[PDB]
UniProtKB/Swiss-Prot annotation, chain C:
Changing residue 16 to L: In RMS and LEPRCH. This is Insulin receptor. The chain holds residues 335 to 946 of 1382 of the full protein. Glycans are attached at residues 30, 90, 110, 202, 294, 312, 464. The lineage of its organism: Eukaryota, Metazoa, Chordata, Craniata, Vertebrata. Changing residue 123 to D: In LEPRCH; partially inhibits receptor processing and autophosphorylation; strongly impairs ERK phosphorylation; induces wild-type levels of IRS-1 phosphorylation. The modification Phosphotyrosine is found at residue 67. Changing residue 396 to V: In RMS; decreases post-translational processing. The gene is INSR. It comes from Homo sapiens.
Swiss-Prot record, chain E:
The record marks 16 as: Important for interaction with integrin. Residues 1-20 are annotated as: B. It comes from Homo sapiens. This is Insulin-like growth factor II Ala-25 Del. Disulfide bonds join 13-30.
Length: 797, 34, 477, 50, 32
């Protein structure tokens, strides 16, 4: 036909040389698996001129293992499109294992894997794996398992064509934050269908017919598909089989077809054939409840029970994968089942679909090392474990080291019964003893000798608390919490060993409840052990228990749930009690001192000051206050005369109001050669439930003083020349000196700081006739300039 | 020290009103109330 | 020294830190203890600092559901107890402990028990073989008292040891190469992990450890060697430590990380503890020199002992220059299981310088009166003529006498034609480093004018030099 | 001979079979024989097609 | 990187010569 041109052939196994590989030449669909492996002495040249373009689908799975020599599948299966995964190879529908010389994966026409996962592993030279978007290929992307390929290290490089060359024509794809174009080889880019279309798409992106799967030659045609969703019939894909019967869940067949299979299997007891029968408009190899079949191929409902018992080879079956589980579809088990599902991936859905119909087990049930097996509920209809064959020690149920086993059954809904054997439970961390005791009750074991081997101290690292504790009273200091939960005792208060109170810092109302974990201080609850309350008489007299936790940081939030501690015993119950996860926060208190007071002479008007928040605000830091004290100048500075021998030349180096979150401040108005005491504090709150210290000078005069004044002379007589000077007031006025020169290189004099002020005192004396000059250095603390004009006069003595 | 007075005041509250017991030893609320 | 200690009711339930100080320095306790610690941090050292001094205890000793106590090595000083019927079943020592690993180094000290049984239940990480030594070395061995599937069930009685085939050392790197070890099937060995610690020589595995995570040992991981094709010649595992302290003793040992097995579980291996010295290297830090002048010809300085001795510190060298003005296990086991499943189905049968010897100080001999100096300090750890030394810098100057600076010599005013005069003057000789009076009245003279030709102070670099007494003379009319 | 678990099993068993192919015909495991137990040449040859 | 690439190379295989992150990796660089 126009959809599938070639034949359909059963599963193949190509081994030890590629000579037998001449079977895929004419097949388009394989009703089985395709295994190509163990052909060491083959070389790439052998695969240089071998291809299989007509193959388009593999129903079960594809496996390749140590096929030496071939470098890529891009020339071997150019047209493979769909792997339905009806029967899987250990959860996997595509497997590539230890392909020594394989370099890139090819298979650019693969566009849907209906069931199972993919496992490409230990290919020492394989790359072009990160360049594949599995989310589009598998309708579910998790559970994939690709590791130890060359791409994992060695910085293997892949070069997707088109988009990287500016030619586009290579779809970009999604990564959590690093979108990238994706491809199978350096010359084949993966197809991506527009979301509106699992159905196929054309070259330009038009949607194919709703029944087509993967690809189609022209859009919106029931025919011309490449692969069919649901069922295929004579060149078109149909939603369901028209009256023809469904066969192998992928195609339609007539009555004669199934009749031939029935006759052939009857005529040949090959142990590879099935007495195919018809049932519920389907052609199937084994039709419970309809076991009998007449001379027709149609099975009919039974009169009386007809369970379709399933007999186990050697009497023990290990359910280690979906492949093992799937082998029991539709099954009463005439043996014992061992469940050994390792690995982190969870497959409870598949187990229920395959094993959910089992109603009884003849032998024992053993569950060992099942890691990600959360619950046994997937045995949706198991109701009897006869125990005719027992695990050594006479155990009927045997659970050991189930890291995540949590619930056996919904005992409110379920029923169970075991006619013999004991019960064994060991090292199951998260299985609470309450469930085990319920099973003891609802399994008939309590109805006889009992003496089951339930290892107390199961349930560790899990919370099995079945009662509440209520905080009857609380107090909130800024460093302490009073806490008084209501009293509680088991039926016999001697079982009460005390209270264990848990707490940690929790700045948010969302926190995970206790589950049983370590005690490292980085994240774990801090635990304080509390002795039991006194037992005197009825509660009306006996006070409630309580605690006083102490040493807390103020104003922060904590979760302070409490739980009881009791002695364990098979004889006794009331496994414990646990309060809620209530939040409380200690009261706030006055903040700490502000940090890092800094000063700078930025602007001549005022000091500019910066600070840092208090080390511990002890509250929601909201408010700051600053004092700027305008200190007066020191005492001796107004009178001390520095003209004295040895005495050095001197040098130096309410308006208050609060401030908003801004952590810097500037003020208006100040002197020059100035800068004074600052003290400031912070507030987390008119109550003013709130000083750091810093003193700093600011700019000097910031201009040149060079103060003008009565610089003129007046010659009354020799030594009476009447030279005067006036006080500088704009700066702080702490005049260090006035330079007096009698210019002979300006022979100089110093001026007394206040004897001059008495009445122009300390004037120069004893002048000679002729020109004389002077420029007065009315010197401030800095005194960089301060010189007047070098005025000169002709002395006439 | 002063912590003893501060804490014990908390316990008594409105009610009106040892070092060998709650300083040189571990102390619990059940005893302070006495 | 003896410190007899007694308690109200005799029994104290020690906690992590609080209530630990009470027994500080106590001994021959007249009481009992419960030591119930299940949290905290830095428990090993703190408990040592408070309880590490007990030598004997009366009554009985109980350790109950303590979580973070990996071992009672911090109890090591305990070496006797006045055993008596102070516990149910006449018990004397009572343990009942999630992470307990070992009690004490049974090769080091004995332990005397007066009487009574012993209790050991639910101690998952404490090896049962370790309990056997507790039987032998304690005074309760066998005949006198009675004391298996609740302790050590999660431990591993490693019964093979790894030799360190090849060891080489360097200035900051040690190279190790131990003999290879493979379980019955090589896939189980996830790899080696190496422990090392600076040991200035008696440390043991468990010292300084708690479940809270304060382990002193530094730990690194080494993957297995690329397995050799030839079964009888393989690649010796190895590792190369880096960033180490020179001349420093390091204690190291290795432990295999082998995966579990449902049937007979293969046991790991541990090498012994070995100590290796990093090689010596030249020191490089005569740090923090401090200097001051004792006198004009006496210069004194100190310096800090090197922070990087890098070898037994030998003489110092000083020079002066006159510059004058579980998930992983499951992952690996799942890979192994899938590989085994694949194999199970696809195969079917048919210059002035000194050499200071000891002290970090020196007073250099008499030298120029006031000049500064540039000083070099170098440390060494080899007195051999082939010495190794590698120079801190600090500057200092000698203080001035300030008396030789004064002229104490010729000064007078030469008199000449009317209003012509000049003050001759003598430059100080060998001074300790301008000049300025008359009427007072002031002036300054400097280097420039001394080539041209009343009091004077005659010192610039130091002030308040002796003011020469005035020279009086008549007007120059 | 001891054990041959893992890739060693394939490497060694290939050497035993040589040019002969591994016998297969679709309708305990070999690992149960030569990984969890001691293995000898007399048994490996049964996995080659004579 | 840095001086390591020469100093460790000398230390580990100085007696084998060189040809070109851990002992097992860089013991290969020497020309034994």
């Amino acid at each position: 036909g126009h959809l599938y041109p070639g034949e359909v052939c059963p599963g193949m196994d190509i081994r030890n040389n590629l000579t037998r590989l001449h079977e895929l030449e004419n097949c388009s669909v394989i009703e089985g698996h395709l295994q190509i492996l163990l052909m060491f002495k083959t070389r790439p040249e052998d695969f240089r001129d071998l291809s299989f373009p007509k193959l388009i689908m593999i129903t079960d799975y594809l496996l390749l293992f140590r096929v030496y020599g071939l470098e890529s599948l891009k020339d071997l299966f150019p047209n493979l499109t769909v792997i339905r995964g009806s029967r899987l190879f250990f959860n996997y529908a595509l497997v590539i294992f230890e392909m020594v010389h394989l370099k890139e994966l090819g298979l650019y026409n693969l566009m849907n894997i209906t069931r199972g996962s993919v496992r490409i592993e230990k290919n020492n030279e394989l790359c072009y794996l990160a360049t594949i978007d599995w989310s589009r290929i598998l309708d579910s992307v998790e559970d994939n398992y690709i590791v130890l390929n060359k791409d994992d290290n060695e910085e293997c490089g892949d070069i997707c064509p088109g988009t990287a060359k500016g030619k586009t024509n290579c779809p970009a794809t999604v990564i959590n934050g690093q979108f990238v174009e994706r491809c199978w080889t350096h010359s084949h880019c993966q197809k991506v269908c527009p979301t509106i279309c699992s159905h196929g798409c054309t070259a330009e992106g038009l949607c194919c017919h709703s029944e087509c799967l993967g690809n189609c030659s022209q859009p919106d045609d029931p025919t011309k598909c490449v692969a069919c969703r649901n069922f295929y019939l004579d060149g078109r894909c149909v939603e369901t089989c028209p009256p023809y019967y469904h066969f192998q869940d992928w195609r339609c067949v007539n009555f004669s077809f199934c009749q031939d299979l029935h006759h052939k299997c009857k005529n040949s007891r090959r142990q590879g054939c099935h007495q195919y029968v018809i049932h519920n408009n389907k052609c199937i190899p084994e039709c419970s409840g309809y076991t009998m079949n007449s001379s027709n191929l149609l099975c009919t409902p039974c009169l009386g029970p007809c369970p379709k018992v399933c007999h186990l080879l050697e009497g023990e079956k290990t359910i280690d994968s979906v492949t093992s589980a799937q082998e029991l579809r539709g099954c009463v088990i005439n043996g014992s089942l061992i469940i050994n599902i390792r690995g982190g991936n969870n497959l409870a859905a598949e187990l229920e679909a395959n094993l959910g119909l089992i109603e009884e087990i003849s032998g024992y049930l053993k569950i060992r090392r099942s890691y990600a097996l959360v619950s046994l509920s997937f045995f949706r209809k198991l109701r009897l474990i006869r125990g005719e064959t027992l695990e050594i020690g006479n155990y009927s149920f045997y659970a050991l080291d189930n890291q995540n086993l949590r619930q056996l059954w919904d005992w409110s809904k379920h029923n169970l019964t075991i006619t013999q054997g004991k019960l064994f439970f060991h090292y199951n961390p998260k299985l609470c003893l309450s469930e085990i005791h319920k099973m003891e009750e609802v399994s008939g074991t309590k109805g006889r000798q009992e003496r089951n081997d339930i290892a107390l101290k199961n349930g560790d690292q899990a919370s099995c608390e079945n009662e509440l504790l209520k905080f009857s009273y609380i107090r909130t200091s800024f460093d302490k919490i009073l806490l008084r939960w209501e009293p509680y005792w088991p039926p016999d208060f001697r079982d009460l060993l005390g209270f264990m109170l848990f707490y940690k810092e929790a700045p948010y109302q969302n926190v995970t409840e206790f589950d049983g974990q370590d005690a490292c201080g980085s994240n774990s609850w801090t635990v304080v052990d509390i002795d039991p309350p006194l037992r005197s008489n009825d509660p009306k007299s006996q006070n409630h228990p309580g605690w006083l936790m102490r040493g807390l940081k103020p104003w922060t939030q904590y979760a302070i749930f409490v739980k009881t501690l009791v002695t364990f015993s098979d004889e006794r119950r009331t496994y414990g009690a646990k309060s809620d996860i209530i939040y409380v926060q200690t009261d706030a208190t006055n903040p700490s001192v502000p940090l890092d007071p800094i000063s700078v002479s930025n602007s001549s008007s005022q000091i500019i000051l910066k600070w840092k928040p208090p080390s511990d605000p002890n509250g929601n830091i909201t408010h700051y206050l600053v004092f700027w004290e305008r200190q007066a100048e020191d005492s001796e500075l107004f009178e001390l005369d520095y003209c004295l021998k040895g005495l050095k030349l001197p040098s130096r180096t309410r308006p208050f109001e609060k401030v908003v979150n801004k952590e810097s401040l500037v003020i208006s108005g100040l002197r020059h050669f100035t800068g004074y005491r600052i003290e400031l504090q912070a507030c987390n709150q008119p109550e003013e439930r709130c000083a750091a210290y810093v003193s700093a000078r600011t700019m000097p005069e910031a201009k040149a003083d060079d103060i003008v004044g009565p610089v003129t002379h007046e010659i009354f007589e020799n030594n009476v020349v009447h030279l005067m000077w006036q006080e500088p007031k704009e700066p702080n006025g702490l005049i260090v000196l006035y330079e007096v020169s009698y210019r002979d290189e300006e022979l100089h004099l110093c001026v007394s700081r206040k004897h001059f002020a008495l009445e122009r005192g300390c004037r120069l004396r004893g002048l000679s006739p002729g020109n004389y000059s002077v420029r007065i250095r009315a010197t401030s603390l800095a005194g960089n300039g301060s010189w007047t004009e070098p005025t000169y006069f002709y002395v006439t003595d | 020290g002063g912590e003893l007075v501060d804490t014990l005041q908390f316990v008594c509250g409105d009610r009106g009103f040892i070092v060998e017991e709650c300083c040189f030893r571990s102390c619990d609320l059940a005893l302070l109330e006495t």
